[PDB]
Amino acid sequence: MEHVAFGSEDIENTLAKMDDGQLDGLAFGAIQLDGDGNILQYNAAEGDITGRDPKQVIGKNFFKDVAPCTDSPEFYGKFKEGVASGNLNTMFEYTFDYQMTPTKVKVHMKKALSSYWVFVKRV
Template sequence: MRVSPDFDAPDLAEKVEALHAYEINQLPFGVIRLDAGGKVDLYSTREATLSGWNGRPNIGLDFFTRVAPCMNTPAFKGALDAAVAEGRVDAEFVHIGDFADPYRAIRIRALSSADGGVWLFLLRELS
């Protein structure tokens, strides 16, 4: 694998878009890509493992109603929708909880993808 892109890199989305799916699955943080309509078109195996989602289907599902309805809030989805409407997504959020641990803090970077969708990069403290 090429050098792993840093979670805080300003050009993280561009670096990840240059990777093969296998390489994305090996990143030390979770990766989800949503299409322009909010449906999941990439859900890394690392994210599935870290979040506790595991082998459940997710590709083609609406992220905010079928995968992560807990993120369907004005603070998260509302801010994301506003950024998409402005034409550029570059935001960071802290979300509490996932399938594996409802009390775990997750740092989420949301960045525009080249195809008009949105990348979600999810970083959890590993202990």
């Protein structure tokens, strides 16, 4: 395990430039998106929560392709507001239900220091 808690105040500093291997050591799901929502990084914990293969989703668009259930004002709308402002720091619960058993999660989206993080744990 990497020793980082979900929701930590300086999480973007701790995960800064973490490589794909170390990201796979986190206790929580971690996705890194570009400002368009394309997937740059996606860790093992997230693949375990959602069923997706962390190796295959890299390069797909999260909102258009992988996660249409997040293409909504409550998810994508918050993301894009944060991208446009260059300020993003929002934590909310959400249900993932596309081609999967509906799974409720706590989501933390936060601008990265490089890029935007989506951190995920079950609730």
